[model samples]
Every structure is written in C-alpha cells, then in structure tokens.
Target chain A: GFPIPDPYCWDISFRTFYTIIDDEHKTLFNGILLLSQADNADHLNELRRCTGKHFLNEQQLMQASQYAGYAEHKKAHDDFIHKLDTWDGDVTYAKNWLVNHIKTIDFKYRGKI
Target chain B: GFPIPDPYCWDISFRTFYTIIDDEHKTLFNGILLLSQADNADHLNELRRCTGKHFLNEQQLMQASQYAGYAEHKKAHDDFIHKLDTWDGDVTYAKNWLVNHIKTIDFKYRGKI
Candidate 1:
C-alpha cells in the first residue's frame, strides 16, 4: 500500500533496490523517465499525478521525479528504456538496469517534501 | 465530531441527554421518526442512508435508529416533530427541539453497527 500521510518521503533506498534485484533475479523490463529542477512546480505537479494514480508505467517515472538528483534519476530511467529498445536478443542489460537504477538510484535520492 | 471506529456503539447515553437539557432552556422542535423490527434490512438501509449522509433532518433520525430502544427513539423524534408542526403560538418549542432533541436525545441513543 502507498504511504498514508507520512512525514518522510522515500522508504526504499538505492541499496535496497539493488539488494532486491540481486536476491530476486528479476530483470527490469521498461521505464518512464522524468527530469526537472528542484522546486519546479510544473514538474512536481506532473510527478504528483503520475505517482498518485498508481499506474504501472508511471511508477518509475514518479519515483524518478522525486529523486534529489533529478538528472541522475532521469538518466537511470532513460538508460533502462534505451537498453530494452536496442536489445537484439538478450535482456540481461534491461534486468541489470532495473536492479541497479530503479531499486537503487531513484529510491536513494528521494527527498522530503 | 462523530466517533471513528470505536468498540462501544453509543457514546451518548440517555442520562447524558437529560444533563445537557437541564443545563439549557432549549425546547424541542422538529424530527423525523422511523420504526421497524430488528433485522429488518430495508428499514435499516433507509436509516443508514439517512444517518450517514449527515443531512440536518436526518441526524436526529439516524441516532434514533441506533438506540437499543428503537421504539422510544422513534417516539421521541415523532413527538418533537408534532410539537413543531402544531405550534401556532411560539417558536420556543422549535428552538428547544433543536437544542434538546438534536443535541441531546439523538446524541445519546446512538448505537453500534
């Protein structure tokens, strides 16, 4: 369940993301990326909608928007999507990206509202 | 404020109702009465709607349904309404009803689900 009016923002950190992926052997499939400056109301509003609605495609996007390192978060999501798009046969890269970026980068940098 | 998910059903007891009335000069005004047998789903459903919506007229009616003494509660509301409808002389009965019945009697006999 989504957090209900909690003071802190991110519960899942970057290290936790990697640990889960490593433990589960699950590969990242696809992602949506977002990048904007801190305190950017327009970007935040879009991110809020994306996260609050709980859409699968928007999950990573929402999390990425919450990252303290907005550029890095966008990069992670973009990298994963790029790998999936270019893959000829193997999905290892995509999986590794999910493990490394989504579970790690976005979760690690989430900031307080 | 209405109680939220409590163990005991009725917070306002009959004795409590009298205490408030004794402290105030308000006369009984208007009420909507409901009477039905135990385990009567249709009546209960109607009562549930009337109460849950928080409509002004329905507040007294809702509490009346919740009381263990359902018949007494109905009588109280019906009596109040009768006073209001027939009173051609003064508004004291109406004002009293708002304070006594709405604030006191209905508040007291509220029951649990």
Candidate 2:
C-alpha cells in the first residue's frame, strides 16, 4: 500500500558512478528488500554487515581522496548505523533511509570519488 | 529517534526550480513537520489539501506541456494520495514518503518542466 514499488532495484540515477560503491549499495538494497518479505534476524545481521563494510570502504575512499565533506559524510554514516542498530524491522524505515542517504549524502561524492 | 533532522526545511537540492511547485512543496513540508509535532487531524487535513492542490497544479502543467511521462507521473500522484489518505499519523512514514517522492518521482520533472 505504501509507495515502495521496487525497493531492491537500484535506479542508475542514484548511482555514485563508482563500481565498488554501486556494487555494495546493490547488496544492501537486495538485503533490505529480502528482509521485507521475511522478517529474519539473520537477514538483518547480513544487511548490517553489508552496511558496516560499505560505510567503512566509502569512508576510506573519502579519506584517501581528501573529499572536503569527509567529516560530515562519515558523521552521517555513524548516525545511520546507530539508527539501524535500534531499528524495529520496519521495512519502510529501512528502505526510505537507504534511499534518502544515497540521494542526499552518498550522491555528494559522485564525481569526487 | 529517526534521522529526519529538519523535515520542514526544504533543501535546495530538492527544489524543482519552479517557483510555484517549490512554494507548494514548502507548504507541504511545513504542514507535515507540524503534524509530526502535534497529532492533530486538522493538520493532516491542511497537509492533504495542500497535497491535492499541488498535484492538480503539477498535473495540469504536465498536460499543458505535453510531457511524455504525464500518465505515469499522474499515476504516481494518485497512488501517493491513496497512501496519504490511509496514513495512520506516522510522522516517519509521512516524512520519508514525501522525501522519496521528491527525490524519485518529482525529480523526474526537473528539467522537463
């Protein structure tokens, strides 16, 4: 009933144009999409693992490239992790959070990275 | 706590560059922000009214311009109204739905309109 038509499909418009980043994002998207169908704790764990790894890798990239917005971007990642830690398995929350983050935060590093 | 730091603040990145659309979007944003603060039916009514009027104006613009995606975009607006109609006063849902809709659906008309 909500407006998530294809939560798992990664629209190219949101891509950072980085192969690694896009691939990792794809994993995270698919993970959350599956979790929506079946509320499994293990699935969440897998998703969290993917999230953590992706954040770390992206941060590392930002750091190596001396991205000006590194601090703010990393802070966003940290804050998102905290929210994910306390999430109650609400698919809408998970789905929207990821989408918004990619649009607003992750997109900032598109050409720079 | 969710990650909507300023749900009422219309980030410039989301602006459609159309004064009328952006102004109406601002009203919708402020309405939802206030609704989150106070669970009042009147607030929701105001937000719904704003949403309906904005959709009408946007659809009219699309039709007048002969935008190729008019049919799909109007369908999106229709579907969103249905979701908003059935919304249970969940601020997070309202906030994210609006944000995602702007980023995904509304953004489609950025340069076209």
Candidate 3:
C-alpha cells in the first residue's frame, strides 16, 4: 500500500532541499536499512532515537516558521513516535511509515521552511 | 584494553573536523549502540555497510590530501572490515575497535586535512 518500493535503498528524490533535514533523513533511512537486515534491540532503540531527533528537529523548523500545518505535523510526529515506542519488530510497517511520512508529511514543509 | 568507557554514547571530542567524516562516525557509533541493544543479522549487515561506506569516504579524503598515513589507514580499514565479516556477536570488540580507531587512527588526519 506504500509507495516506496524498497526501504533499504534511499534515492535522491527523497531530498527536502534542506541540508540538515536531508542529512537527518538519510540517517533515518540508513537506520531502517540496517534494521531491515536484522532486528535487534540496539538497532531498534537507535532507530527510535534517530526518529525522535529528526522529529524534534523538524518540529522546531515548523514551529519557527509557523507553517500552517504545524499543529497537524506535530500530531503526526507524536503519533509516529508512539507507534515506534510500541513497535513489534514489524520491519515493513516501519519502512512504509517512514517512506509515507517522508513523501506525504515531511514534504509539506519543504520550501515553506 | 580500549580506552573507551562506553561505545553507546558519542562525545564531542570525537569530531574529525570534517562534516562527512564526523557524520559517518556518528552513524557507526549509533550502529554499535544498536548492536549493543540487540544482536541480529539485519543490524549487523547494516553496520558492515555503514563501516564500508565510512572507510571509503575516509580513504578518499586521505588519498586527496596524499596523507602520509593513507596506506596504513586503508589497511586498518580493510582489517576492520575483515573482522566485521568474521564477527561472532562480540559487541565489546566492535565497540572498542571503533573508539580506538577514532582516537588513534582517525584523529591523525584532523586539522591536517
């Protein structure tokens, strides 16, 4: 149901044109790829850490910009974090969520930020 | 005995003065932290991939500068990759190697670049 064909690979098309955002995005994607290759508590924890860092960085960006979708975007971030905390090692679900969020949710703040 | 107390945490002192190098280092450290939390195939493979990528990036940096330690550095990278391939779930070994390499080997190129 998700548009991303392979979560293991990161394509240039995912770029948000923001350096920090793009860099963080790549790190998150890399974390997912690592998780896909193996499921472990350490990697999962790191993924959660990476997710939290990225979301906070993103949230601040939206907050400072006062983006119209700030509230909704933050809610989306919160919901994802909750999902991640309660994650059951479902790699595909994690993968799809990332890709979906990137294209659908993250993209909204691209130039607006 | 490695001097590193904990591989799970990254310290500001690890900075290589190069953005790419530092960023990759964090990813590697992050990978180790993940591996420490849980042992599995996916995470291990991802760590290997991250290691390989970082080594290559560092190699190119050294090569461009004609850094005196280029040969030895590359060898270190190769040896580590071999060790990673033959790894048997020894997180401490992996952790120590990274810290030692960063402090002793990686720091050699700092500011000189």
Candidate 4:
C-alpha cells in the first residue's frame, strides 16, 4: 500500500521509533496513503475499519495505563472517528491530524506504558 | 475480539513494550485469536491478508535498517507466511513464533534507528 504523509511531510521520526505502534500506524495510514495516491471506496472502508480498531485499542491501552489525558485523548479519537465517517478520500484532514496527534497527543502517552 | 494465546502461553510482556510493532502483532494475531474463539473463513482470509502485509512491512524495515539478521529474519517471516497459508487458527505455532521472533530476532533491530 501507499505510505501516509509521504514519510516526509513532518518528522515523526521519533514516532517511528516505537516500531510496534508505528506499524499499526502504517495499517491505518495505508488506506489514506491510497486515497492520497488515488481512491477506492473499499480502501476508504478498510481504512475506516482499521482506524476504528486502532483507535479502540489505543483507548484500551490508555485506560489500562490510566493515562492522565484519557478523556481528552478519547475525544481526539472520537474526532477522528467522526471525521472518518464523513471522510471521502480527503487525505488533508487525516494527514494533518495524524501528524499532530501522533507527535503531540499520542506522544504524551509514551511514558505511561 | 479474543486475544491470541489467551495473552498467556508464554511471556512476552517485554514484546508489548515496543508499542508500535506489538499493535501490529495484535492485528496479525487477531484472526488467530478469532480462530481460537471460533472459526470464520472470513477471519482466516483477513488474517492471511494482514499477515502478508505485516510480514512484507517487517521485511522492508529489516532490509532498510540492514538488520544483521535480515536474511534470517526474513526467512522467519517467510516461514510464518508459508505456515499461514495452511494455518487453521492454530494458535500454538503463532503464539510460540511471535513471542520468540519479537524478542530474539526482532529485538536485534531496535537500536538500528
């Protein structure tokens, strides 16, 4: 699949270091990458489904870890999910949101685990 | 969904530490978990599809990092992919291989970045 944010838009080189989570990021990013490169409804649905799973799992981990920003973090996840529902191959929102979210919001939880 | 190997079997609490890759493992292990819980031909195919993608991504990272065990590590992935073709939700093999591979084989690449 295509890569998200072209691996160059922003430096989440730090984000990539988490190896495991980064890979999940790839699966979520996969469909967006495809959308940016082009589009297929299947890809959109796949992307949406995977993103939901990833988001849910992230929430669980956050809850388990009692992450200080749990509610806010969840709100952000909900934001993505909400946007995802109305999303129609628009990579702009997903791209910017992921870059900021991973490096900032999601990044905050790194220490908790 | 059902967690693979019941999240027991063997100890890879350490594997969960990487965060990024471990989540990918969950996606890969998803079908196996589902298989353990119940058989769905769709789950098997979905598991197969995601595992292939995951294996390929792992190989790419290994090669890009020029991991010392690239060849060996790739072979392990190939072995898994091969077994995956015939896998019928057999959690035993996936459980053992993933735990060992992440710690022993994959651990070698952590510092490369």
What lDDT does the true structure give each of the candidates?
0.33, 0.72, 0.76, 0.63
Q: Model 2: per-residue lDDT, tens digit, B54-78?
A: 8999999888879989999888889
Check candidate 4 and list the clashing pairs: A19-B21, A20-B20, A20-B21, A21-B19, A21-B20, A21-B21
Candidate 1: docking tier: incorrect
lDDT of 3 by residue, B1-113 (tens): 44674525455557576756765787677567667766877567667877888899889988897898899989999999998899888898888899999999999888666
Would you give me the overall lDDT of model 1?
A: 0.33
Instruction: Give Cα distance to truth, residue A10, candidate 3, Å.
Output: 16
lDDT of 2: 0.72
Model 4, span B1-113: residue lDDT tens: 22434422222333434544654665654445545554666556656776787778777876775777778877888888888777666677766666667667777777673
TM-scores of chain A in all candidate models: 0.38, 0.88, 0.90, 0.82
- Candidate achieving higher DockQ, 2 or 4: 4
Query: Please, what are the lDDT tens digits per residue for candidate 4 over residues A1-113?
Result: 22444422222343434545654665565446546654667557656876888788788877886788999989998988998888766678787777777878878888785
Candidate 3 colliding pairs: A37-B42, A38-B42, A38-B43, A42-B34, A42-B37, A42-B38, A43-B34
DockQ result, candidate 1: 0.02
How accurate locally is residue A46 in candidate 3, as Cα lDDT from 0 to 100?
62
Index of the highest-lDDT prediction: 3
Per-residue lDDT tens digits for candidate 3, residues A8-113, read 5444457576756765776677667667766776667667777898899888988887899988888988998997888777888778888888888888787787
Which of the numbered candidates is closest to the native, going by highest TM-score? 3
Task: Report lDDT (Cα) of residue A84, candidate 2.
Answer: 76
- Going through the candidates in order, their DockQ values are 0.02, 0.01, 0.07, 0.07
